[PDB]
Amino acid sequence: ERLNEQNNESYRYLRSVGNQWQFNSRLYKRFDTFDLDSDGKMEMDEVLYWPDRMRQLVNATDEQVEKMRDAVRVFFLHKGVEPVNGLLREDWVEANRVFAEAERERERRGEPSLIALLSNSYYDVLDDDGDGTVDVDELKTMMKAFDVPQEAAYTFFEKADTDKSGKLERTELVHLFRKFWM
Ligand SMILES: [Ca+2]
Ligand SMILES: [Ca+2]
Ligand SMILES: [Ca+2]
Ligand SMILES: [Mg+2]
């Protein structure tokens, strides 16, 4: 009905590979957090707010910052944020479901996961001392960029630091992103 190939990049993707999948309050809290002016629509300039704040907190290379901005753009375009029309609240749930199928389809096809590309682009920006890994204080900066209490990094670092090494490796940050989105 509402979202389709002409409307939504995850539908465009599914149909380009022949996958016929059709869509039949914690989730809505998420939309309403992204909808910065509370008008009932998510637009791309609103989603680019988050990497723009992250970039102020650290001193990543222009290349890293652009890899992050572009990965956030791609991610949210596939999450249903269209360049002109953006994404309506009425469409949020179905945009999330079709996106989850598109991520499954990518993985079957051996194609890169968009959540993984997002997470890796943050990882390079978060590792602000260049030692190779993200520590808990670097994770706080992430919480600060996302407007979440910095102390919540203790909780998240713990859940994510699955090899108990005291540092997040790339795959662990991917795990934390993924648990978060789907
Ligand atoms: Ca809005
Ligand atoms: Ca580091
Ligand atoms: Ca670890
Ligand atoms: Mg606006």
TrEMBL record:
Protein name per UniProt: Apoberovin 1
Transmembrane segments: none
Binding annotation for Mg(2+) 3: 161, 163, 165, 167, 169, 172
Binding site for Ca(2+) 3: 161, 163, 165, 167, 169, 172
Keyword annotations from UniProtKB, A to Z: Calcium, Metal-binding
Keyword Metal-binding: yes
Highest classification ranks of the organism: Eukaryota, Metazoa, Ctenophora, Nuda, Beroida
Residues holding Mg(2+) 1: 35, 37, 39, 41, 46
EF-hand domain ranges (all copies): 25-57, 123-149, 156-182
InterPro entries xrefs: EF-hand-dom_pair (IPR011992), EF_Hand_1_Ca_BS (IPR018247), EF_hand_dom (IPR002048)
Native source organism of the sequence: Beroe abyssicola (Comb jelly)
Source taxon at top rank: Eukaryota
A GO molecular function held by the record: calcium ion binding
Binding site for Mg(2+) 2: 127, 129, 131, 133, 138
Sites where the protein binds Ca(2+) 1: 35, 37, 39, 41, 46
Residues engaged in binding Ca(2+) 2: 127, 129, 131, 133, 138
Pfam families named among the record's database cross-references: EF-hand_7 (PF13499)
